[PDB]
């Protein structure tokens, strides 16, 4: 088994376009996710609200859909509740709230794509371990 | 010689069957208080709400325990690290429900055993001895402070102190493994080397000295009658013992100097138990054992399990089952 | 003493070091190349990082028979494509 | 309880004072060899 | 080679520094050279921390223990503890580093070049351990030095920028202390508080007015006592209670250091005032409280009435009563209800946590702070995997509070052992039997039998 | 007669830097191969095909996590000879099948025999009583009971301890969850022997060092001892009085003291070995029936004994699928025992 281009091809948007990440992007995504997100999202769960995880099936059913690069990049700029009804930048790290979440201050557009790619690729690797919690450790 | 001088001469007298001494003045009342309360509570104490959830655990013999399952139960999680003497309860019945006796026993015990260490220093000074036997005893004593005082302070509750009982000890050890992975901590590992090594060198030194006893008796008598209490001459041949042990390994792996041999016998288990006590004492502040969970990963990113991951599976079972009604929120942070 | 030359004698002699300044690095390098050429993998049958699984499989290739264990492993090794 | 508390408070102070005055009562001199340690 | 071998000195090489006991010149050098090492580590470690420091991560995510000390004094930081200027950190490091060369120079000079004994060189700098007068005078000079040191903290607090105040209205800020607490009822009242839960002895100090005022008292006390000890010589009752030897004085200091190390361990573990959580991360109690706050907030937003939610045990799922009736967070954190922190106190009323404030007055900055502290609980492994012992690798984190508490418990413990070792030996040496029992004068043989 | 046997006897018993002896013919190859196999295996050999585990430096494990793991459960109790019907002479398959474990365990067993024969052989040549060899029976009883009898009672070698640091930790935890081994009074006696042995070690060494006679003028008291001196180097009389007054009782016989030091840890290890012989058969001290009968009928009755069984039940359900892969345990989330929230 190895990290092939097929593994690294992920949905770019909802219209069905894909994009293929380099191994560099994927690994950068992993480092940046550890930097800015893993304190709450380690392993694809959410420590401060375990009802919502980062599984692709969960992200597909969010509003708007978050199971693609554009959806996830938008979420890191302007996060919303699962139904899209409320904007939660004041309580969730984002570019819009980089003044109160200072670790977001040094994230570029290219960084957001890499973090997004890591979130979409990881379940293809780990399966149920991703978003599964302690039961699958 | 006035009365105070007479009293001081009796307290510090080297002719008492048991030495009293100034540490003894604190030791004797505190150890008696702890002993009497422990014995009574072990037999007759009613069940105690250890975890503060109105779920009393039965520790005493009269309430359904045997010698193996019985305990004095730690005081309530609702109390935390608050001081709970008898006179802070509205009744003895309240005090007992909330595990008052545990606090009374361990605080009196820890004072008594600390003065026991001082008393070891004090009698050596009265007898003209060298003073460091009490330093050897600091290793078991530090260990008792670790599980009765230090670990409660770091976790914020005497309800996480070690229970005063046999099966309660095993509970403490299993929950400790789930919450700190102590088996993977190098200070517990040095503690194991300390006590395995101590037991090894104990049998070793015993076997070597016994193997080289000078013939002084016939086959029908115990060889122990060949040594006479107070005799000037050594009772075994240390040159013979070294000649044997040095050939068992090689010559320079053997002690020929009794003084340095016996220093080694002191130092190894004492140093190792110091580290064991420092393990409990530093895991009291959640600096836990080595965590290698999912450390080995294949080329794609699959987790390749190791024995460390199997240990983690067992730790999870302990974690999810312990104190099964006491947690409402997803992380067990103390 | 049992007759052999003392160890402090030997390891402070120039000739000891003339010999062992060669033979010690030489063995060290032989151990390096045993790994770096990949030979250790094939001697002991240890998987390389890309050889624990097939690309899609997540099952362990566990030996389940006593007397065909050798064929089970050879079969598992073919199935790596 | 109040009587208990004063009783314990008194007993503890009694024993602690013995300890302190005891070790203040020329203790270095209470050894079998040299008895002049000032 | 004066006293530099075992035959001449009586001490083996592994006890070699005991050869210095009566060589005040070389003993001076060893002390100055060691002070150089301490100052060296302070400067060097600060520079290392600065080089590895990212302003926009929290300090406590970066393995920092010395920059947090500098920041608490008011340097480099602004509102909320945000780093505004790393140049103070640079200065502190460089100056300590430079100074260590001066101390190292003097240490190496006195240790191998200068006079081995000072007594023949100078009657002021020379000393006899047995000279009770000279010993309390050297003691006096250093009590005055120590007291100036405490007044310097006050001068910083009152005249040179102030201190970082985690309790400052607004979210925490540097604040000049203008009315330090001087009332000795308050200052020495801390000394008489119980050390048990809900009291916390001196670890419980929770405002900078008390911190600053306590150092004013300590400053005067030390300065006053140092003059007293220069001008006086030990009284008879003191002369008869102590051993008067170099090893004895060492053993008294070792006992004192052990006690301080244990106190310091508890200070960094429980106190979030002089160890602000902005810089050190939340305390253990703090993070546990913060988890209950987080889930009360989550569930109340989903529609739960948290005041009447009965949990599985029958105790409130979110809220309950402390043993004296105060309203407190439920679950296992019931043990931590003595916690106080600036993000939690606005929900507190006379009877504890106030249900009407919980329903109506929780601000988003509190939700953020509780979620931050709950996810930076001081739990982690020795290889710095953050989280519970069963957590998977991903987060590289061990709290500064755990590093500081464990290190100083270990050090305090070994200094208690050192006290016992050296105090026992000092007693035996003064009495004359530290080398063993005299065969022809064995005390036990002149004593009646026990039976 | 001075035939070849006596000539060989002479050479084997030469007083050299490392004594050889007849016992050395067995001891040295078997001890060397057992060690070399452990080092070989923990450096180069996997446990993928037997356990589903990486276990060597070559795979990225560290000193704490490397092991020579037991063979797969399907091998039963096979000797796993290299030339046997499983490996069929193939060195690589042999390693992948767990052959190194039987290799180490078997050569280790015969090496231990060799080491004990060496204690007898050297004691006979030097003229001492063989109490050192008698004391070594306890390590042999432990090794034989844990590494050979225990798995021979079970389904296969798989459940013997694997030769590694963390692997042994897993063995400790497996014995708590499945065997309730802390409850076993034979283990308890072993614990007393080991801890009491360490106690005796510290207290004897400390007592000697603190009742020394002043036999020299230096502050390092080590120098003031001569191996051929006739006098005791410390005062048994003062040692006796101190302990009588501190603790109530004391040793007065020095021969008894040192025999007791042999006796305590040796007897403890023998007792623990008997307990493990029972666990070979699952003959556990798992339960107190009276507790279970009361607890079944009275849901308000709780002791530390019932609390610990809940922990064991967690250990079993949560570690078993990964720890026993040949069983193919599929436990859905809904069946896993869990308390509230965790
Ligand atoms: C000469 C000496 C003679 C002997 C003297 C004997 C006197 C009596 C014994 C004293 C020790 C009693 C045990 C105290 C246990 C404890 O709960 O100590 C904890 C306390 C801290 O108390 C805590 O203090 C806290 C203060 O924080 C409060 O205030 C803060 C302000 O920022 C925060 O807001 C925080 O959120 C808020 O809660 C709270 O009150 C907590 O509820 C409270 O538990 O430490 C402290 O008082 C100070 C530290 C105590 C010393 C540590 C003892 C360790 C000794 C180890 C010995 C091992 C040796 C082995 C021998 C071999
Ligand atoms: C004192 C210390 C001195 C120092 C130690 C000296 C070191 C010497 C080393 C010797 C090594 C002995 C190897 C024993 C291997 C073994 O046993 O191998 C086991 C085999 C039996 O094979 C097993 O048999 C089992 C039952 O099978 C049977 O039942 C099956 C299902 O019903 C089928 O019917 C099957 O066909 C049938 O064979 C299972 O099949 C197992 O998978 C299979 O391993 O016995 C055999 O080879 C031989 C069995 C008879 C001889 C037994 C004596 C040796 C054992 C002593 C310990 C006994 C303790 C028992 C528990 C307590
Ligand atoms: C903080 C650590 C420390 C310090 C400050 C000292 C200091 C001292 N030791 Mg001790 N010692 C120590 C730890 C220390 N020791 C340890 C860990 C051991 C166990 C091995 C010993 C064992 C020991 C023994 C057995 C003896 C001493 C002795 C001494 C004294 C004389 C040394 C001498 O003459 O050597 C001369 C050495 C040299 C000439 C070689 C170089 C030494 C210099 C100072 C090194 C400086 C390097 C540094 C980078 C220079 C910076 C200069 C720059 C700032 C310009 C001196 C005061 C002796 C003594 O007590 O005499 C009365 C003695 O006999 N020590
Ligand atoms: C400021 C505190 C202080 C001072 C000034 C002294 C001074 C002295 N001690 Mg004391 N001691 C202390 C603290 C102190 N000690 C503590 C805290 C303990 C408890 C462990 C002791 C226990 C002790 C014993 C048991 C003895 C002394 C002795 C002495 C005398 C000789 C020391 C010597 O030359 O060592 C030489 C230094 C060494 C041999 C170095 C030891 C190396 C340590 C063990 C390594 C520690 C590891 C390190 C922290 C981390 C690893 C580093 C590595 C990875 C590179 C000297 C008067 C001797 C004596 O009685 O003389 C009267 C003696 O026998 N001390
Ligand atoms: C007050 C003491 C203290 C404390 C609390 C810390 C804490 C920290 N250090 Mg610092 N540091 C210290 C002293 C301290 N250090 C000293 C003396 C040095 C010079 C060696 C350093 C140089 C240093 C560097 C270069 C780095 C740190 C880093 C760190 C962080 C990670 C630590 C880690 O991963 O350890 C790993 C754990 C261990 C190494 C365990 C050590 C076990 C010891 C050897 C046991 C010894 C016990 C006792 C002393 C011996 C007793 C013997 C007995 C016989 C008496 C942590 C905040 C890292 C960081 O994050 O910087 C931002 C980092 O890169 N430190
Ligand atoms: C506190 C440690 C200490 C102590 C007790 C001494 C004591 C002594 N030194 Mg040493 N020395 C030290 C540190 C110390 N020195 C340091 C750090 C250095 C490197 C700079 C030296 C380098 C040195 C040399 C080269 C010589 C001495 C000499 C002497 C002797 C004569 C001193 C004198 O009368 O000067 C008169 C007093 C003064 C000039 C007052 C100086 C005031 C200072 C410089 C200003 C700052 C002081 C203030 C407290 C700053 C605080 C810094 C601190 C917080 C780090 C005396 C025994 C002489 C000697 O041994 O003769 C044989 C000698 O030749 N010393
Ligand atoms: C480095 C600090 C220091 C040291 C080592 C000394 C050392 C000494 N002082 Mg000095 N002193 C100091 C600072 C110091 N002093 C300061 C700052 C002042 C001004 C406040 C004084 C004012 C002073 C006076 C008036 C006298 C001394 C005296 C002495 C000598 C007798 C010590 C003694 O018997 O204590 C033993 C302590 C006691 C007997 C009281 C304690 C009572 C018991 C032990 C309970 C306390 C323990 C408890 C756990 C503490 C917890 C905290 C507490 C607040 C509750 C000794 C040489 C005596 C002397 O000979 O003068 C020439 C003396 O008469 N000192
Ligand atoms: C006596 C003795 C001893 C000891 C010694 C010692 C302890 C010493 C110390 C010493 C010291 C303590 C020294 C110090 C020094 C220092 C220095 C020399 C420094 C320098 C610095 C610098 C040069 C800086 C630089 C810089 C800057 C300025 C900027 C930033 C960056 C940098 C860093 C680059 C011993 C043990 C050996 C033994 C013998 C005797
Ligand atoms: C700064 C500060 C403060 C204050 C503080 C203070 C004010 C302190 C004081 C302190 C003190 C004031 C202390 C004291 C101590 C003492 C001690 C520690 C003692 C000891 C003693 C001893 C040890 C003795 C012994 C003995 C005996 C008993 C018998 C006889 C003999 C002898 C001598 C041995 C506060 C908290 C406000 C706040 C924060 C800051
Ligand atoms: C198995 C087998 C065999 C054998 C082989 C051998 C015999 C081998 C050997 C091998 C060897 C013989 C190896 C060795 C190795 C070693 C090592 C690898 C080491 C390392 C070390 C280290 C790493 C160290 C460390 C340390 C310590 C421990 C302590 C002190 C400090 C230090 C850190 C230094 C044969 C062919 C017969 C057959 C087939 C099977
Ligand atoms: C909270 C603790 C408060 C402690 C207060 C300490 C204040 C110190 C003031 C000095 C008090 C010391 O008072 C001490 O008492 C006894 C009498 O009772 C004296 O009498 C002593 O004399 C010699 C001293 O070598 C002894 O042999 C004798 O047994 C004893 O009677 C001590 O010589 C005296 O020093
Ligand atoms: C195995 C022991 C077998 C001994 S065999 C024995 O060996 C002698 C040489 O020592 C010969 O002289 C003799 O003929 C022969 O029988
Ligand atoms: Ca003076
Ligand atoms: Cl439990
Ligand atoms: Cl909870
Ligand atoms: Fe002995």
Residue numbers in the entry:
A (entry chain V): 1 to 137
B (entry chain A): 11 to 344
C (entry chain E): 4 to 84
D (entry chain I): 1 to 38
E (entry chain C): 23 to 473
F (entry chain D): 11 to 352
Question: Could you share sentences copied from the article?
Answer:
Four diffraction datasets were collected at different flow rates of 4.9, 7.3, 8.5 and 9.8 µl min−1 (corresponding to 2.0 times, 3.0 times, 3.5 times and 4.0 times that for the dark datasets, respectively). In addition to these four datasets, we collected two independent dark datasets by different preparations (dark1 for the light-illuminated, flow rate 4.9 and 7.3 µl min−1 experiments, and dark2 for the light-illuminated, flow rate 8.5 and 9.8 µl min−1 experiments) at a flow rate of 2.5 µl min−1, and a light dataset with Δt = 10 ms at a flow rate of 9.8 µl min−1. All datasets were processed at 2.25 to 2.40 Å resolutions. We evaluated the boundary of the excitation region as follows. Isomorphous difference Fourier maps between the ‘light’-illuminated and dark datasets were calculated with the phases obtained by the refinement of the dark datasets, which showed a negative peak covering W665, the second water molecule from O4 in the O4 channel [Fig. 1(c)]. Here, W719 is a well defined molecule that does not change its position upon light illumination, and therefore its positive omit electron density is used as a baseline for comparison to determine the peak heights. When compared with the dark1 and dark2 datasets, electron densities for W665 and W601 became lower at flow rates of 4.9 and 7.3 µl min−1, but were comparable at flow rates of 8.5 and 9.8 µl min−1. The OEC structures in the S1 and S2 states determined in the present study are similar to those reported in previous studies. The PSII structures in the S1 and S2 states, as well as the isomorphous difference Fourier map obtained in the present study, revealed the light-induced structural changes localized at the OEC, QB site and water molecules in the O1 and O4 channels.
